[PDB]
Symmetry: none
C-alpha cells in the first residue's frame, strides 16, 4: 500500500532530528553522546550528555556520531539510530530517507546506508541536504528559477545554487558554529586572560552574537578560570566585541560566496539578484545576518522560518515525491 | 476516401509546429529538448526545456533536433515527432506534409522522410517553406504575379521570389534570431562588462528591439554576471543601443536582398515594386521592420499577420492541393 | 452532303485562331506554350502561358509552335492543334483550311498538312493569308481592281497586290510586332538604363504607341530592373519617344512598300491611287498608322475593322468557295 511507514533523519553535527510520517518530529536533540571511557558503555545522549560537556571526568568520553555528514564514531552512530529505531520498533517496512551534505563521498554514504541497514533498515534513500533545506525554507525547487541557499550548521557552511530541483553550483567550507564558539573562546582568553568552556562560548554567541549592530544590545557576564590566578574569574563582554570576532570568522565564508557566484552561469546570476539569498540553519539566527549579507553582495537576503528545521521540514515535503519515485519507476 | 488523416509539420530551428486536419495546431512549442547527459534519457521538451536553457548542470544536455532544416540530432529528431505522432496515435493512414527550407539537400530530405517513416509514417510529402510561408501570409501563389518573401526564423533568413506557384529566385543566409541574440549578448559584454544568458538576450530583442525608432521606446533592466567582480550585476539598456546592434546585424541580410534582386528577371522586378515585400517569421515582429526595409529598397513592405505561423498556416491551405495531387496523378 | 464540317486556322506568330462552321471562332489565344523543361511535358498554353513569359524559372520552357508560318517546334505544333481538334473531337469529316504566309516553302507547307493529318485530319487545304486577310478586310478580291494589303503581324509584315483574286506582286520582311517590342526594350535600356521584360515592352506599344502625334497623348510608368543599382526601378515614358522609336522601326517596312510599288504593273499602280492601302493585323492598331502611310506615299490608307481577325474572317467567307472547289472539280 501507499500508507508505508516513512522516517527521515537530519544527522547534523550539532543537532539530530527524526521525522516520522503521521507523528511529526519525534526526536530533536543535540548530537553529543557520553560514554564510559573505562567500559565503552553508553551513558547518555542528547540533552543529558550536552549538559555535561566540559563538566566530566576523564572517565567520561564525549562523542559526536557524525561530523560534517561523515561517520565520526561507528559505535556511536549505530547506538544513536538504534535509539531512534527502537522508539519506532515499538510503534515494519519503513522508508529511510537520509539527507547528506555535499561533501560526503559515495563511499561514506554507502556506510551511512549499511549502518542503517545493519540496525534494521530495509530501504534507505539518500538526498542532498541543500534541496531538502530549500524545501524546508519555502522554495519551490521544481521551478526554473535560481535560488542561493546558505546552510550554516555546526561544523559546515554549505552553499548551493538550486534551479529546477538540481544543484547547479555547490561550495562548502568547514567554518560554522563550532568554529565561532572556538574563536569566542580564544578571543576571551587573549583579551581577558580567562579560560571558558565550549558551552559558555556557545551561549554568548546565542545571547549577544550578531554581525550588524542591533537595537539595544546588552552585555553579559561570563564565568571561567583565570589564567593568572588559577581561581574562577568573572568578566563583562559587550555585544560589539562579540560582533567583531564573528565579523572576522565570516571572512572565509564571504569569499566562498564570491567563489560560488564566480562560477555561476550568467542566467542563474540574474535570478540571484531578484530571488536573493536564503539563509537557513542554526547560523541563520545570528542577529542581522540578512543585513550583513545584503551590505556585502548587494543581494536581497531573507532568513528562513525555523531555520534549524529546514532540512527536516524539507524531508517532510519530499515524502510524497519519493513515494512517487518508489511506487513508479 | 478523401477524409484521410492529414498532418503537417513546421520543424523550425526555434519553434516546432504541428497541424492536424480537423483539430488545428495541436503542438506549438520551442525546439529545445533537455537530455540527461549521463543516461542519454529524455528529460523534457518544448517549454519545460526552454525555461531551463542556461540554468542547467553539466549533466543536462540541451539539444535542438533540427538546425536550419537539417537533422542536427538523430535521437532528438525521432524523439520529437514520436511525441507528436503518439498524440495522433491516440486519436492510421495520415498524410505527412513536411516543409523544408531551400538550403536542405535532397540527401538530408530523404533522411527527414525516413525518420518520419521509421516512427510510423506511410506517405511523407516535402514542400518548400517559402511557398508555404507565402500561402500563410495571404499570397495567391497560383497567380502570375511576383512576390518577395523574407522569412526571418531562428537560424536562417530565407528569401524567395515567388510567381505562378514556383520559386523563381532563391537566396539564404545563416543570420537570424539566434545571431541577433548572440550579438546582443556580445554587445552587453563589450559595453557594460556583464555576461548574460541567451534567454535574457532574446527577451531584450522582443521587449525593446527595433530597426527604426518607435513611439515611446522604453529602457529595460538586465541581470547577469559581472566580469570584474564575479558577482551578479544589473544594467539599464535603452532601446536605441539595441536598435544600433540590430542595424549592424541586418547588414548581411540587406546585401542578400540586393543579390536576390540583382539576379531577378526584369519582369519580376517590375512586380516587386507594385506588390512589394512580405516579411514573415519571428523576425518579422521586429518593430518597424517594414519601414526599415522600405527606407532602404524604396519597396513597399508589409508584415504578415501571425508571422510565426505563416509556414504552418500555408500547409493548412495546401492540404486540398496535395489531396488533388494524391487522388489524381 | 454539303453540311460537311469545316475548320479554318490562323496559326499566327502572336495569336492562334480557330473558326468552326456553325460555331464561330471557338479558339483565340496567344501562341505561347509553357513546357516543363525537365520532363518535356505540356504545362499551359494560350493565356495561361502568356501571363508567365519573363516570369518563369529555368525549368519552364516557353515555346512558340509556329514562327512566320514555319513549324518552329514540332512537339508544340501538334500539341496545339490536338487541343483544338479535341474540342472538335468532342462535338468526323471536317475540312481543314490552313492559311499560310507567302514566305512558307512548299516543303514546309507539306509539313503543316502532315502534322494536321497525323493528329486526325482527312482533307487539308492551304490558302494564301494575303487573300484571306483581304477577304476579312472587306475587299471583293474577285473583282479586277488592284488593292494593297499590308499585314503587320507578330514577326512578319506581309505586303501583297491583289487583283482578280490572285497575288500579282508580293513582298515580305521579318520586321513586325516582336521587333517593335525589342526596340522598345532596347531603347528603354539605352535611354533610362532600366531592363524591362517583353511583356512590359509590348504593353507600352499598345497603350501609348503611335506613328503620328494623336490627341491628348499620355505618359505611362514602367517597372523594371535597374542596370546600375540592381534594384527594381521606375521610369516615366512619354508617347513621343515611343513614337520616335516606332518611326525608326518602320524604316525597313516603308522601303519595302517602295519596292513592292516599284515592281507593280502600271495598270495596278493606277488602282492603288484610287483604291488605296488596306492595313490589317495587330500592327494596324498603331495609332495614326493610316495618316502615317498617307503622309509618305500620298496613298489613301484605311484600317480594316477587327484587324486581328482579318485572316480568320476571310476563311469564314472562303468556306462557300472551297465547298464549290470540293463538290465541283
Ligand atoms: N540563536 C542562535 N544564534 C547563533 N547561533 C546559533 C543559534 N542557535 C543555534 N546556533 C548554532 O547553530 C548550530 C546548530 O545548527 P544546525 O543547523 O542544527 O547544525 P547542524 O545542522 O550542523 O546540526 C549550533 O552549533 C549553534 O552554535
Ligand atoms: N516579438 C519578437 N521580436 C523579435 N524577435 C522575435 C519575436 N518573437 C520571436 N522572435 C524571434 O523569432 C524566432 C522564431 O521565429 P520562427 O520563424 O518560429 O523561427 P523558426 O521558423 O526558425 O523556428 C526566435 O528565435 C525569436 O528570437
Ligand atoms: N493595340 C495594339 N497596338 C499596337 N500593337 C498591337 C496592338 N494589338 C496587338 N498588337 C501587336 O500585334 C501582334 C499580333 O497581331 P496578329 O496579326 O494577330 O499577329 P500574328 O498574325 O502574327 O499572330 C502582337 O505581336 C502585338 O504586339
Ligand atoms: K541539524
Ligand atoms: K517555426
Ligand atoms: K494571328
Ligand atoms: Mg545542518
Ligand atoms: Mg521558419
Ligand atoms: Mg497574321
Amino acid at each position: 500500500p501507499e500508507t508505508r511507514p516513512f522516517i527521515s533523519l537530519d544527522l547534523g553535527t550539532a543537532n539530530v532530528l527524526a521525522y516520522v510520517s503521521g507523528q511529526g518530529v519525534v526526536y530533536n536533540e543535540p548530537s553529543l553522546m557520553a560514554y564510559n571511557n573505562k567500559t565503552n558503555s553508553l551513558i547518555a545522549l542528547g540533552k543529558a550528555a550536552y549538559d555535561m560537556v566540559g563538566k566530566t571526568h576523564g572517565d567520561i568520553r564525549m562523542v559526536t556520531p557524525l561530523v560534517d555528514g561523515v561517520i565520526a564514531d561507528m559505535e556511536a552512530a549505530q547506538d544513536l539510530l538504534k535509539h531512534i529505531f527502537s522508539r519506532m520498533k515499538m510503534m515494519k517496512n519503513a522508508i529511510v530517507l537520509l539527507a547528506c551534505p555535499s561533501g560526503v563521498t559515495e563511499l561514506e554514504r554507502e556506510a551511512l546506508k549499511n549502518v542503517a541497514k545493519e540496525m534494521g533498515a530495509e530501504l534507505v534513500i539518500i538526498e542532498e541536504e541543500a534541496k531538502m533545506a530549500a524545501l524546508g525554507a519555502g522554495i519551490n525547487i521544481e521551478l526554473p528559477q535560481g535560488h542561493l541557499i546558505i546552510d550554516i550548521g555546526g561544523g559546515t557552511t554549505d552553499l548551493a545554487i538550486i534551479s529546477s530541483g538540481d544543484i547547479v553550483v555547490s561550495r562548502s567550507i568547514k567554518v560554522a558554529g563550532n568554529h565561532f564558539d572556538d574563536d569566542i573562546r580564544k578571543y576571551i582568553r587573549s583579551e581577558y586572560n580567562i579560560a571558558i568552556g565550549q558551552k559558555t562560548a556557545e551561549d554568548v554567541k546565542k545571547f549577544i552574537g550578531s554581525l550588524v549592530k542591533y537595537h539595544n544590545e546588552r552585555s553579559m557576564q561570563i564565568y571561567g578560570r583565570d589564567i593568572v590566578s588559577g581561581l574562577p574569574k568573572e568578566a563583562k563582554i559587550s555585544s560589539e566585541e562579540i560582533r567583531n570576532v564573528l565579523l572576522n570568522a565570516f571572512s572565509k565564508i564571504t569569499d566562498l560566496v564570491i567563489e560560488l557566484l564566480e562560477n555561476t552561469p550568467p542566467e542563474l546570476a540574474g535570478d540571484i539578484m531578484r530571488n536573493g539569498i536564503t539563509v537557513c540553519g542554526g547560523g541563520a539566527l545570528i542577529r542581522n545576518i540578512d543585513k550583513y549579507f545584503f551590505d556585502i553582495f548587494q543581494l536581497p537576503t531573507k532568513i528562513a522560518s525555523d531555520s534549524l528545521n529546514c532540512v527536516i521540514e524539507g524531508t517532510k515535503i519530499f515524502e510524497k515525491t519519493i513515494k512517487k519515485n518508489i511506487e513508479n519507476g
